[PDB]
């Protein structure tokens, strides 16, 4: 009877039960291929295989493999029968209609859920923070968005999408690590660099001063030892890597950085709501985890915004999972129970019901 919440990320699936403080299942969004099984899903592939990611930049693009991920989610991870549980799924901001329709059809016709709902990821993180109005910077493995939201509605004309996120930052770290003469080439080595990123990287409050500091001394150098004993030592790469979020030209992307796109997004909204966006800047997703990133955004947004604006960055320690937590809260609400698309409603209206019920 308990509702299920599933946040399908480009990199990680977060799944569990509404009411819980956290997703009980977190596993890679991959299908791997080598009377053995023909494919290995999630942690199966993790534990000889070529990996495919069914979700790209937050959008489902391999439906056959996505079906495998959901099967793995229900039956192997959560160990539930989906026919017995209302299921809340997440989607990226600006997810195309055809996609949301197909998610809906597969849930009702393939998994036979009794009810379902699709929510925008960024809206859920805002809800997790106890707000229905605000602007969210949601940055994960595959995509980054600025999403201004009023009374629970993402305001689509003002949404900014940026195809720079966690995976690109890992790849960039690998690239600049070659300057010190290191070489990381395999899937397992990319994972090692992902870990270096998650452990040693940070966002400098003043990038140019930090570069000067790093040039002067060894004060910022850190070592990282692989389990095999090989050591890699890292200096200014620590902060140059996530600097890319603020200066996308670092990877050759001629696009505004995340501070500028926050400003642009707000400036596209109704004059009256702007003050409320500035005062309610919520960060969510794994790529917002860098030490210093909240401080840096506070400074940059403050530099762009009028003096009249109180600027507040909300960055809870659990923010890697804010989307899921917001889903867990939403699906457990009394007021939300009339919002589910029911099987009966799908039967009568077809997959396009998702446009009328999920917003």
């Amino acid at each position: 009877t308990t509702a299920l919440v599933c946040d399908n990320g480009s990199g990680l699936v977060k799944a569990g039960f509404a009411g819980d403080d956290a997703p009980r299942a977190v596993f890679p969004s991959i299908v791997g291929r080598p009377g053995q099984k023909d494919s290995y899903v999630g942690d199966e592939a993790q534990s000889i295989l070529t990996l495919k990611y069914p979700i790209e930049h937050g959008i489902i693009t391999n439906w056959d493999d996505m079906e495998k991920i959901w099967h793995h989610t229900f039956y192997n991870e959560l160990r539930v029968a989906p026919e017995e549980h209302p299921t809340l799924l997440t989607e990226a901001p600006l997810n195309p209609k055809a996609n949301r329709e197909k998610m809906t059809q597969i849930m009702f016709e393939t998994f036979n859920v009794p009810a379902m709902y699709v929510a925008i990821q960024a809206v859920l993180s805002l809800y997790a923070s106890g707000r229905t109005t605000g602007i969210v910077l949601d940055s994960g493995d595959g995509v980054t968005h600025n999403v201004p939201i009023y009374e629970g509605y993402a305001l689509p004309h003002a949404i900014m999408r940026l195809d720079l996120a966690g995976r690109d930052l890992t790849d960039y770290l690998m690239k600049i690590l070659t300057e010190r003469g290191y070489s990381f080439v395999t899937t397992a080595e990319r994972e090692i660099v992902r870990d270096i990123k998650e452990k040693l990287c940070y966002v400098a409050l003043d990038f140019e001063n930090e570069m000067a500091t790093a040039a002067s001394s060894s004060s910022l150098e850190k070592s990282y030892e692989l389990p095999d004993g090989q050591v890699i030592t890292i200096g200014n790469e620590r902060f140059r890597c996530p600097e890319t979020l603020f200066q996308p030209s670092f990877i050759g992307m001629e696009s505004a950085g995340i501070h500028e796109t926050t400003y642009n997004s707000i400036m596209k909204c109704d004059i009256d709501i702007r003050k409320d966006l500035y005062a309610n800047n919520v960060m969510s997703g794994g790529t917002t985890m860098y030490p210093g990133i909240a401080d840096r955004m506070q400074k940059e947004i403050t530099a762009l915004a009028p003096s009249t604006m109180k600027i507040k960055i909300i960055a809870p320690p659990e923010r890697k999972y804010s989307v899921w937590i917001g889903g867990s809260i939403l699906a457990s609400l009394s007021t939300f129970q009339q919002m589910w698309i029911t099987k009966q409603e799908y039967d009568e209206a077809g997959p396009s019901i998702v446009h009328r019920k999920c917003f």
């Binding site: 305001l155 004309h157 007021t335």
Partner: peptide, 26 residues
Amino acid sequence: SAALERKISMRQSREELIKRGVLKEI
């Protein structure tokens, strides 16, 4: 999450917000 539930249940309708020019969909 009482404060949240309150805010959600009294949200203005999509049609009204589109009519107010707040909500501009793609």
